[PDB]
DNA sequence: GCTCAAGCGCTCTGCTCCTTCTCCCATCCTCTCGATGGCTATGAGATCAACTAG
RNA sequence: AUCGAGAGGA
DNA sequence: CTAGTTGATCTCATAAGGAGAAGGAGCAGAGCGCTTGAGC
């Protein structure tokens, strides 16, 4: 399963126009993670106006 | 009954405008035997009249005895208007000026074509490009007529069609006067008159004469 | 008895079933045990291209 | 040295 | 340019998987040119 996942996604990268494209250059995400942020800088928070 | 006369009539029947003046008008050796009762001699007249250079008999593939006839002059006049403007137009003209008026054989051997006609092994594809050289085998190839594909497809379709309705006919007979009087079926476009000659030569029917004209029957 | 029908066989998908066929099965590391592995001659003719003189 | 097998460690 | 010689070089000689994808079969029905074909 791990090998299949990596061979599926191995060429996907964040481009210099802040878009996520594969080797063929087909866009998959206009903005990485739909927001454009890395995963090691975000943190859990609480939305004060929802509840 | 003259083979010169026999071939002429079939030529007239041909639907010339149906093929947009591209395929030269083919007439079959099967329908040649229809007009001339003695086949034994029909081949003999056409044989010397083949080497006489006024006829081209081309071998076709719808059956083992498939030998078509193309008028020489019309065979000439039509290849240039078809070859010219194409990459293969080069050595096909040579084939015409050299091979056609110097030989009349239905299929050319490898050593024959390469040596007698001085043909290379690269331009030979150009003759295969548009219906000039067919493929008999590794060593020999029958002479081709360009654009013969559509004809035989309609020809075979027509033969089957006429055969079918003849069988369907009540009591399995159908008067010849009842073909001409009745509108030709749309399935066959080569002409109802064209095909009925073909089965007569192919002996799929027999011209049985009676008080009410002549009749055709499946062989018993 | 003159035109809409009724059929009709032939062909064209097509629809599902059954069969067949190729690939695929975590990474890295250590060690031992076994198997493997080929080894006619010697002489005769004959050509040929390079030295070694002429 | 090559192949194959077996026994193992995380 | 010619012979003679020396190696190469050759030739011939005697003896208790699976999931899925791809092909083909067979039947099943729709459609249509056709061939009648017979009721008003």
UniProtKB/Swiss-Prot annotation, chain B:
Keywords: Cytoplasm, DNA damage, DNA repair, DNA-binding, Nucleus, Repeat, RNA-binding
Region of interest: Winged helix domain 3: 147-220
Induction cue: By ultraviolet radiation (at protein level).
Name of the protein described by the UniProt record: Winged helix repair factor 1
Highest taxon of the lineage: Eukaryota
Role: DNA-binding protein which is required for efficient transcription-coupled nucleotide excision repair (TC-NER). Acts as part of a TC-NER complex which assembles and interacts with RNA polymerase II (RNAPII) when it stalls at DNA lesions. TC-NER complex subunit UVSSA binds to the GTF2H1/p62 subunit of the TFIIH transcription factor complex, tethering TFIIH to the TC-NER complex. WHR1/STK19 then interacts with the XPD helicase subunit of TFIIH which guides TFIIH to DNA downstream of the stalled RNAPII, ensuring DNA repair. Directly interacts with RNAPII and also binds to downstream DNA.
Quaternary structure (record): Monomer in solution. Homodimer; when bound to DNA. Component of a transcription-coupled nucleotide excision repair (TC-NER) complex composed of STK19, ERCC6, ERCC8, DDA1, DDB1, ELOF1 and UVSSA which assembles and interacts with the multiprotein RNA polymerase II complex when it stalls at DNA lesions.
GO biological process, one term: positive regulation of single strand break repair
Entry comment describing in which tissues the protein is expressed: Monocytes, hepatocytes, epithelial cells, T- and B-lymphocytes.
Keyword presence, tRNA-binding: no
Result of changing residue 215 to A: Increases cytoplasmic localization
